[PDB]
Amino acid sequence: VQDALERALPELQQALSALKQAGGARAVGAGLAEVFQLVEEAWLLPAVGREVAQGLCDAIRLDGGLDLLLRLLQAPELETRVQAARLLEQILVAENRDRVARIGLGVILNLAKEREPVELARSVAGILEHMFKHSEETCQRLVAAGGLDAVLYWCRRTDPALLRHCALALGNCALHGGQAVQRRMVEKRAAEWLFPLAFSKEDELLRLHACLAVAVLATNKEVEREVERSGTLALVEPLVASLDPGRFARRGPDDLQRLVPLLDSNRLEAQCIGAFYLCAEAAIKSLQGKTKVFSDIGAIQSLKRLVSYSTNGTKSALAKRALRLLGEEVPRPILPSVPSWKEAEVQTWLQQIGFSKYCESFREQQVDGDLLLRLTEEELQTDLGMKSGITRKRFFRELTELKTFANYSTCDRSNLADWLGSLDPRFRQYTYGLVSCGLDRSLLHRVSEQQLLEDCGIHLGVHRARILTAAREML
Amino acid sequence: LVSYSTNGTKSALAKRALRLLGEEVPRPILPSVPSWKEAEVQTWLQQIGFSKYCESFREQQVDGDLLLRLTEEELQTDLGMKSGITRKRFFRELTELKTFANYSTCDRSNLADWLGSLDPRFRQYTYGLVSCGLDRSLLHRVSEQQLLEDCGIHLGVHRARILTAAREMLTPDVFISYRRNSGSQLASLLKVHLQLHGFSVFIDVEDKLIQSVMGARNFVLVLSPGALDKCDWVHKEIVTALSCGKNIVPIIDGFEWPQAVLTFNGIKWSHEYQEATIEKIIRFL
């Protein structure tokens, strides 16, 4: 349309960057300078700047100057490579990153060693940022060769934009890298170097982006402890509480898929950050057209689980705000005292976990808290109607979560829930079966392997052995 | 060779060949299987010739966790695989995925590598072992029966090898006081270098703080330009360190010395000559 005018190439790449025949040190620096300012004005224009940019980046690729640009970065006489690099930043689109990855990792990683000037670093950092978004092979090449060490070096820096790229890059690495990339990221103590960016005052994006990068490393329980030893994690919850996603928000379906696993984690800090971005993405997106991607990505069911079973207002508020925007019911937090539950409480819980269809079955049989917490696979199959054997597995996945969250004050006397949770935070769901059969701390030193199976209901045997060898340890 | 692929050269050539023959080009699948949802499983089914047993999975809402624990009876009675050799192909497919899966959300002791050291075909038993609560420090008590009923290692030759291999295992020191909105950046950088050098710290996160100041053997006061002109939280802590008088060092950063705290010497800041200033202070305090 109006882009079709510019898609006519009103410039012919300025006769293809002086035709490539500038030949002069001052000339070559000049030629890039205008084609540089040509792109930004093309980038920065209303409502077609984004779509017209792709073609411009496409034109340069088919014109072969990418080799020219990659050819210029070597000239020792051209202390002003700076024009060559900063031009490279904007023109990087996915189709272009592949071309750079095939051959471009030579000079770029060779360029990182020119760490002295601000002007060169503040753009190469952007190059590394865009490359890290590529596949694992590119990241695993950059990390070993020295690209990662380059970004960590620039944490001592003070320039705004430079620090911005460095943090945004480190996060891109963790998301798209694997367990070798991440294990090396901590091995270099990258989370530790992320505090000075995490603790800033001049800018907020810089604090926010760093908190995301650490949170992703906080969703990998091979190296959680080492991350926590740095102290950079305590700054997450206050920030997200101190800020507003309503306007501070100002990503494709694939990028969002990497935000949800933050939610479905046991780390409170990761859940908070994910909801902050997730609500932010919803707000801009809801205005910016409509799409039901959130149902396919699965964020809704997780957000409903961050208000229920929730024990922090900050997390609950952000999730609740995101849910309302997408036009869906806001679940009510459930009471912890399950043993005292009656029919009505169970019914609402069923709706909050996707079991609204096996609702009348429970009501007819008058399932209360005591019964629900002792519900066998035959009672589900023969009385409540769950024929499928993997639907019954999901139900027990749900019930396991409730039991670990339940509140056994009306039931327990010797605080056995803590004792189980000390061994394993997944053993706390066996509290009810143990006490309803009449056991406490002073009696487990006589229970047998068979008893924990028939009566209490501890089915898996690995759990049974661990409980026994620990109970016998009381003496 | 495009899916499960971990090299661009191989992927590009295969992708070019597939397009020429006029067929859909599959998309590489995510490695993190445990975090999969319904949509991910459906696409995977199409990439391995199981597009017909697709609605069956969707109806039963098969996610990554369930797929990785899918027994021969659940396939037969719920998903509809009657033929016993179709179910063998499926487990051939699932075996390949498990050896390629990404157990970061799931594993803690890096058990996948341990299994892969014994045999690159044992790495598919990682999920069953950890979802049942096991790690490196617990396999020295697991039994032959347990690896069958719970984890799901069916073939016995594998079980014996795992067992005979499992049995084979057999105070804060410094403080930093700064002025908000001027000196924030400097304090963090000072912390990072000292943290790397074996000396912990108690910097501020934003009367318990006064007690903490007493605990740290050492003290630091960042001399931000135009800092003390205000004078305070700065005053209360410094006086506390004056009482004990334990190795106080103010680092000079554009401060002109405009009480009895100036009766001291310090270290100047060189922004770009780092690891020299840091090296000097290490001796100082």
Curated annotation (Swiss-Prot), chain A:
Its main location: cytoplasm. Changing residue 193 to A: Constitutively active mutant; strong ability to trigger axonal degeneration caused by disrupted interaction between the TIR domain and ARM repeats. Changing residue 391 to A: Does not affect phosphorylation level. Predominantly expressed in brain, kidney and liver. Expressed at lower level in placenta. Residues 341-405, 415-475 form the SAM domain. One of its GO terms (biological process) is response to axon injury. This is NAD(+) hydrolase SARM1. The gene is SARM1. The chain holds residues 61 to 546 of 724 of the full protein.
Swiss-Prot record, chain B:
The chain holds residues 377 to 699 of 724 of the full protein. Changing residue 126 to A: Does not affect phosphorylation level. NAD(+) 2 binds at residues 179-180. The TIR domain mediates NAD(+) hydrolase (NADase) activity. Self-association of TIR domains is required for NADase activity. The ARM repeats inhibit the NAD(+) hydrolase (NADase) activity by binding to NAD(+): NAD(+)-binding to ARM repeats facilitates inhibition of the TIR domain NADase through their domain interface. In contrast to classical ARM repeats, the last helix of ARM 6 does not fold back to interact with the first two helices, but instead turns towards the N-terminus of SARM1. As a result, the two following motifs ARM 7 and ARM 8 reverse their directions and lie perpendicularly. Moreover, ARM repeats interact with different domains not only within each protomer but also of the adjacent ones. Residues 171-285 form the TIR domain. NAD(+) hydrolase, which plays a key role in axonal degeneration following injury by regulating NAD(+) metabolism. Acts as a negative regulator of MYD88- and TRIF-dependent toll-like receptor signaling pathway by promoting Wallerian degeneration, an injury-induced form of programmed subcellular death which involves degeneration of an axon distal to the injury site. Induction: Up-regulated by lipopolysaccharides (LPS). Changing residue 117 to A: Does not affect phosphorylation level. Homooctamer; forms an octameric ring via SAM domains. Interacts with TICAM1/TRIF and thereby interferes with TICAM1/TRIF function. Interacts with MAPK10/JNK3 and SDC2 (via cytoplasmic domain). Changing residue 271 to A: Reduced NAD(+) hydrolase activity. Signal peptide: none annotated. Changing residue 99 to A: Does not affect phosphorylation level. Changing residue 78 to K: Reduced ability to form an octameric ring and promote axonal degeneration following injury. It comes from the Eukaryota. Changing residue 43 to A: Does not affect phosphorylation level. Changing residue 231 to S: Abolished ability to promote axonal degeneration following injury. Predominantly expressed in brain, kidney and liver. Expressed at lower level in placenta. This is NAD(+) hydrolase SARM1. Residues 36-100, 110-170 form the SAM domain. It is found in: Cytoplasm; Cell projection, Axon; Cell projection, Dendrite; Synapse.
